[PDB]
């Protein structure tokens, strides 16, 4: 068993975490439990405070002079570690290994919260990633309001994710009538994995004398961003410009294969991606699972995926929503290019 460790530049504070991927179940988020190690000194008349903050950084300025930081908080939780719920197995083992100067902290995440989604920065950028980020900050203070120096503090980036549900969803179907040009479309399944190809049926029948001459199929990413007002960003991640046509009073059935990936969608600035601990690259942002009916507006970034087929008549289009998730890992995701450099 191996646990993560980060220390402050001062060298008097260190936060021990055992995992950095706290999985969000639709109604129960995993708890952020850990242990902070402090010298017998440096705490004679002070207190240890651990703060878990979720931010929605939307600009790479970071200038705390005139409000030019663009690091608005979304959920702030504060706990008291040094001044004295049952401890978990990880906290008990960490305390025994470290010693008596080991104070455990536990955070509970309320449900219906945004996950770690970071927009694609772009080639010529040297700033922080834009998106929802979860930050674990531990410092030493006795008033909870005095300014804390960067040297005398510990900051750790944790990532909350959602994985594919065990039970597969219903098969997506769609059909619209236009004047008739009946267009039917359906996928093979509802839950898809990253890199797994998507098969769509474009079985279409035509009855009018008008003839189509172009079939357009695309997979679009629906990143609902809401901080000041409700906004929706639609970016296509897959493209297939077929040149199939159907004669009047005849049918046409075909199966098309699509696969979204980041190699071609690299120049698309602002594209939603998974949470990034560092400047390393990550795959496309997964979908966001939300409670049915019992969920209000989620202030943050919500990622949705819809594949559409369009009959360019000279247009009739339908929407097929699908779910893109990573499968449940065995041990843990590394959050890094495993063959670095």
């Amino acid at each position: 068993t191996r646990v993560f460790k980060k220390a402050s530049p001062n060298g008097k504070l260190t936060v021990y975490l055992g995992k950095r991927d706290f999985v969000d179940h639709i109604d129960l988020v995993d708890p952020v439990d850990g242990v902070v190690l402090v010298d017998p000194e440096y705490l004679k008349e002070r207190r240890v405070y651990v703060t878990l903050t979720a931010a929605f950084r939307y600009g790479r300025e970071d200038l705390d002079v005139l409000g030019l930081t663009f690091r608005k908080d979304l959920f702030v939780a504060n706990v008291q570690s040094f001044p004295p719920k049952p401890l978990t197995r990880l906290q008990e083992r960490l305390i025994k290994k470290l010693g008596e100067h080991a104070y455990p902290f536990t955070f509970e995440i309320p449900p219906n919260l945004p996950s770690s989604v970071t927009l694609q920065p772009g080639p010529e950028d040297t700033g922080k990633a834009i998106g929802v980020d979860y930050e674990v900050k531990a410092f030493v203070a006795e008033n909870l309001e005095e300014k804390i120096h960067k040297r005398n503090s510990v900051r750790l980036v944790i990532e909350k994710v959602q994985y594919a549900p065990e039970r597969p969803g219903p098969q997506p179907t769609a059909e619209t009538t236009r004047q008739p040009l009946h267009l039917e479309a359906s996928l093979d399944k509802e839950i898809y994995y990253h890199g797994e190809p998507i098969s769509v049926n474009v079985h279409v029948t035509n009855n009018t004398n008008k003839t189509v001459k172009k079939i357009k199929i695309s997979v679009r990413q629906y990143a609902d961003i809401v901080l000041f007002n409700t906004a929706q960003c639609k970016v296509p991640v897959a493209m297939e410009e077929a040149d199939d046509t159907v004669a009047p009073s005849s049918t046409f059935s075909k199966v098309y294969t699509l696969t979204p990936f980041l190699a071609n969608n690299r120049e698309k600035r602002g594209l939603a991606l998974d949470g990034k601990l560092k400047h390393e690259d990550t795959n496309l942002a997964s979908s966001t699972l939300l409670r049915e009916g019992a969920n209000r507006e989620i202030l943050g970034i919500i990622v949705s995926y819809k594949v559409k087929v369009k009959l360019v008549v000279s247009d009739v289009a339908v929407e097929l929503p699908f779910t893109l998730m990573h499968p449940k890992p065995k041990e843990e995701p590394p959050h890094r290019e495993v063959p670095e450099n």
Partner: single-chain antibody, 222 residues
Framework: DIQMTQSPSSLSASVGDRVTITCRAS??????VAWYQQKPGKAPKLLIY???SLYSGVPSRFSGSRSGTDFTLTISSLQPEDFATYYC?????????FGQGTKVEVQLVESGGGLVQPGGSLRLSCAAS????????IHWVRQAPGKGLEWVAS????????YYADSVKGRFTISADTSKNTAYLQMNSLRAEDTAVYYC?????????????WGQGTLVTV
Amino acid sequence: DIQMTQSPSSLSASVGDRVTITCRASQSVSSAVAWYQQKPGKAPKLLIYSASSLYSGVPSRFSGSRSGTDFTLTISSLQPEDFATYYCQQYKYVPVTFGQGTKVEVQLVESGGGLVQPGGSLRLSCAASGFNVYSSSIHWVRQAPGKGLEWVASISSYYGYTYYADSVKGRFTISADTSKNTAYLQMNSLRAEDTAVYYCARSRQFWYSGLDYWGQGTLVTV
């Protein structure tokens, strides 16, 4: 780079005893260490993919442990069908290095390969079935006659990244065909030291967990 030296070079034992192969890493790498078993005349086959996690399919008698950089592989009982060469491999960096080899005493098909004069060109086709190109990573590993495995090149079609070994940079190139699900390796300026058995290995593109599947062998003589 990172170099590994294995304490047992030639191990002799009987049936019904516990053996222990020791692996040491030059640099303080994480638990990203994999163990492979290669029977004579057969491609290496993965046993442990995280230096502590047992692969699906292998017998439970195999085990692994880590202490700093002291990776070890232990077998509870040396069964008759266990005599092979065991290799220690890390995957924390692009220049992956295999162990020197300890001796105990979804189909991938590779095309091409043959007698090529020095300075010539040769292309190998790696037909891949059962997995998708974008959901997997394709690697080429060569094994010289009587020597250990050596990594050549790797391609990740999801991020569009290609890597090559320092000894084959420029001369060697790698490509993958999405429509045919085939990986191609074109060789230029073949030197006399390229005589090796080339294996096309497949690994999970997301959260690399060792080379799950290997090829059959396309020994090239120059």
